[PDB]
Amino acid sequence: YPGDLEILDEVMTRSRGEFRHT
Amino acid sequence: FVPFEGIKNDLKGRLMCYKQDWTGGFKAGFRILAPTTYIFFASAIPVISFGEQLERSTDGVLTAVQTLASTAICGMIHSIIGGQPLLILGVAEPTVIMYTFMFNFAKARPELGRDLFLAWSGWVCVWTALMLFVLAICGACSIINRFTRVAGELFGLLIAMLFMQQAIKGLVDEFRIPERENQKLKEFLPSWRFANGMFALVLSFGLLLTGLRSRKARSWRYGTGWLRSLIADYGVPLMVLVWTGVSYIPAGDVPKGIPRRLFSPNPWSPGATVVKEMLDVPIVYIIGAFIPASMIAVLYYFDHSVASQLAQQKEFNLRKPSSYHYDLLLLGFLTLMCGLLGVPPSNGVIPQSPMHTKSLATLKYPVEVKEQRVSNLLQSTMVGGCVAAMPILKMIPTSVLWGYFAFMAIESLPGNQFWERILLLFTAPSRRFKVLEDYHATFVETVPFKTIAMFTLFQTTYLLICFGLTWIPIAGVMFPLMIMFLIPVRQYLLPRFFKGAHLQDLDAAEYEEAPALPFNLAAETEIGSTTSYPGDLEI
């Protein structure tokens, strides 16, 4: 299963670190 | 807006968790070093790049020594007595631009010259500190909820444009003779200059492409988990090291300065407070320093607050309170100190602060953040120690740093909804179903395309006007005012032209996303109602 940083990599924008709401 | 009320509440809240803020960091053991090293590398490389930019722009008065020293001292002080330790401080590009404007102004006036630039900058910093004190005391941080997306993303794209412009300027300059160098060296013959320029292109593009690729390592299917995480976390410094090593390959057969390496001097070499020179500045210019001081104060009031907000997103499930007012007050004090010491001021930086919070997070299978002061203190101390290691850092070719500038510009884009809307504006009308076939912003489905187009055209015109303003020799220092005016514009003018829910969708506080739709569902939509069928060669 994916690690914490692997998961957080997908839900946070790279430009500004904003959480994505889907 | 009761004076001192916000500061008092912040201090009362943060004084109840100080000792825990330290012991929790101590209780983490040696595992606190991984986030510390990650954030240290995220902080150091851009600050060195900005130091080189200043070295070029101030004729050597300010270099990477000063930017690193400012970052380190401000970070250490903020870690010890700051309100929100998750916030990372550093010298940023808007500060570099403002200082470049100030140096250009000072160099052209006989009364100031290059010998009083740092004294006049000290006065500018004094004015800025006073303005930030007033803003913090009067509770101006209560209205930071009005710093909406329209301003933040426009500012981000403007900084991205400036980054790319700097990369281009540096790469162009690699082909020329530097201003303050012995022009008779073999390094500067036309043949060797052409060779240096082409080698710089190779190195910068290698750095950029490899660094961009490394960012997605955690989603690869090769290697081990720890190796993938290592690449994803330290790709940038690793690629900087790799391309430095590459640059040393032809060292045996080329002149000394091929390729060109960092221009910042070594502080250890015998050749090497501005208060004494501050009293030598004429009174007229002491008063006139109020003009750039207000713009710098506006910049810091915006950026510090936004960085802290990003670091404190509610999805992090943080348990300790915020300190916006007190942190603005401390930033004022730090700006005063930096001005008195002859270094540019530091402020909260993006995306370093949210990335710090993320690096401190774990999922309890549900985000839990280890909030303490040790990580910030240690990373600031390491940034300070980079000053002693300047001889090692002087081995980095400048082209690698120009590539890093391009990297920062391109990395400004991925989560920027303004950039997404520009790309959508350039999309062929019959190919928008392709936009609906992947993850996309919700306004793409909930807002008519005409409204999106008008909103984007207005924003793009504003951005281009600001970028052009930065090119005007003297008035360019007013661009933070252009940024600030977007707040009242959004609050009062936009509602007249745009309708309610559409403005809310296009300027949402949270990042709203929708999953990919099936083709049969991407065709019923208004935006995807003009689906042209593919050709034979497309099949």
Residue numbers in the entry:
A (entry chain B): 624 to 645
B (entry chain A): 5 to 276, 281 to 373, 457 to 630
The paper states:
Boron, essential for plant growth, necessitates precise regulation due to its potential toxicity. This regulation is achieved by borate transporters (BORs), which are homologous to the SLC4 family. The Arabidopsis thaliana Bor1 (AtBor1) transporter from clade I undergoes slow regulation through degradation and translational suppression, but its potential for fast regulation via direct activity modulation was unclear. Our findings show that AtBor1 is regulated by two distinct mechanisms: an autoinhibitory domain at the carboxyl terminus obstructs the substrate pathway via conserved salt bridges, and phosphorylation of Thr410 allows interaction with a positively charged pocket at the cytosolic face, essential for borate transport.
Full-length AtBor1 was overexpressed in Saccharomyces cerevisiae, purified in phosphatidylcholine lipid nanodiscs, and the structure determined at 2.3 Å using cryo-EM. Particle expansion, 3D classification, and local refinement of one protomer improved the resolution to 2.15 Å, allowing the unambiguous building of an atomic model with robust side chain densities, doughnut-shaped aromatic rings, and water molecules in the cryo-EM density map. Our 2.15 Å structure of the wild-type transporter is solved in the inward-autoinhibited (IAI) conformation and reveals previously unknown detail, including C-terminal (Ct) domain swapping within the AtBor1 dimer. Importantly, we were able to resolve the Ct domain and construct the model up to residue 645. This revealed that the Ct domain comprises two α helices (H11 and H12) connected by a loop, followed by a rigid hairpin that deeply inserts into the cytosolic cavity of the neighboring protomer in a domain-swapped manner to block the permeation pathway like a “plug”. Therefore, we define our full-length AtBor1 structure as the IAI conformation. Specifically, Arg637, Glu641, Arg643 and His644 on the Ct hairpin form salt bridges with Glu502 on TM12, Arg153 on TM5, Glu604 on LH10-H11 and Glu323 on H5, respectively. Interestingly, Arg639 on the Ct hairpin does not form direct polar interactions with surrounding residues, but its guanidinium group forms a polar interaction with a nearby water molecule, which, in turn, forms a polar interaction with Arg153 on TM5.
